[PDB]
């Protein structure tokens, strides 16, 4: 009785050109997506994401209990008081299967204002011994970089979607200041499979996470080929098939606010499956003063009463929210 839902695969290579027309072919399949369920597939990305996924693997397969604790945020090393977002998000054997990396802009050293500033959101990234992990830090530098372009080129898609000239997203995403964050997720094999690390839906499916509205304006996720996410509708949640060629695009809610909910943040949730996967989101933050106007695209004069939202403001908030809902991850 599950249904699957409509994800489109969408070439987005015209993103990256001067094709003016066949950007805005582009856009009409990202508009269509995102009116339908909300996800697409971006084919045609230009990023080996085989190197991504191997050298994610190489990471979540070799470091040691000494170094989770050395890397870890504050939710599991009270030591670590300044790293509520960057770090290493421990599993709890027997009760919490889920561990994960999470870094953010690379260009966030001791030394940029906003960290002398001790701006809230922005933190300094932390990273294992090189010599443990040699060529990890270069690879996770450079993967912040790729994902980043791709996800400019995709900016320009939603916004020539919406009817703006292509930069009207993308001014705000700068490699200077922007908040956006890479998390390498392992989701694991284990057996016996913990009864604490497993939620049961109010429809009955077991779930690693629950359902939630990203924290993001896009978020640009690579997964490995493992079927787990599920889409919510009206007629109640589908499944995203899995595609461990593409990266999986959804809108959050910052786009969804700014947009008077035209295009909604999909409610998603993550299905339980007992087998060895990565998941790789990336998480199209904007700067921490971004402040987008907010518009009605159903009108005529585009008008919406909507307030206007600092960026940085938000996604304190949301963070919190997301802890607060679905758990410490
Ligand atoms: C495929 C998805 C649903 C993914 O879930 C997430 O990554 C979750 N995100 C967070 O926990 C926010 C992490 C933010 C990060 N620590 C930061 O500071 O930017 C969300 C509910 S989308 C998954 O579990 O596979
Ligand atoms: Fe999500």
């Known amino acids: 009785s599950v249904s699957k839902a409509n994800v489109p695969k969408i070439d987005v290579s015209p993103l990256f050109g001067d094709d003016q027309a066949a950007k805005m072919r582009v856009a009409q399949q990202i508009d269509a997506a995102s009116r339908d369920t909300g996800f697409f597939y971006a084919v045609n990305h230009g990023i080996n994401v085989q190197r991504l996924s191997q050298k994610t693997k190489e990471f979540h397969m070799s470091i040691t209990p ?12 009270k030591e670590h008081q300044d790293q509520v977002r960057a770090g290493y998000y421990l599993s709890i054997p027997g009760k919490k299967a889920v561990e994960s990396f999470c870094y953010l802009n690379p260009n966030f050293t001791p030394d940029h204002p906003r960290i002398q ?12 011994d090189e010599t443990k992990h040699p060529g990890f ?34 001014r705000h995403f700068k490699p200077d200041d922007t908040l956006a964050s ?29 359902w939630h509205e990203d924290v993001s304006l896009i978020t640009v996720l690579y997964q490995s080929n493992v079927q787990n996410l599920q889409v919510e509708t009206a007629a109640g949640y589908q499944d995203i098939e899995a595609d461990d060629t593409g990266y999986l695009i959804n809108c959050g809610s910052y786009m969804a606010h700014l947009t008077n909910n035209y295009y909604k943040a999909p409610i998603h949730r993550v299905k339980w499956v007992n087998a060895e996967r990565q998941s790789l989101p990336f998480f199209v933050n904007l700067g921490y003063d971004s402040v987008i106007d907010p518009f009605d695209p159903r009108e005529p004069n585009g008008k919406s009463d909507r307030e206007p939202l600092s960026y940085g403001d938000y996604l304190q908030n949301g963070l919190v929210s997301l802890i607060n809902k679905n758990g410490q991850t």
């Open 66 to 77: 000494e170094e989770k604790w050395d890397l870890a945020i504050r939710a599991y090393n």
């Open 117 to 128: 500033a001790k701006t809230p959101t922005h933190e300094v990234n932390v990273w294992p």
């Open 137 to 170: 830090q270069d690879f996770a530098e450079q993967y912040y970089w790729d994902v980043f372009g791709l996800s400019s080129a995709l900016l320009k898609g939603y916004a020539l979607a919406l009817g703006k000239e292509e930069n009207f997203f993308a």
């Open 182 to 210: 890479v998390v390498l997720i392992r989701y694991p094999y284990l057996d016996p499979y913990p009864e604490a690390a497993i939620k049961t839906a109010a429809d009955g499916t077991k779930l690693s996470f629950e």
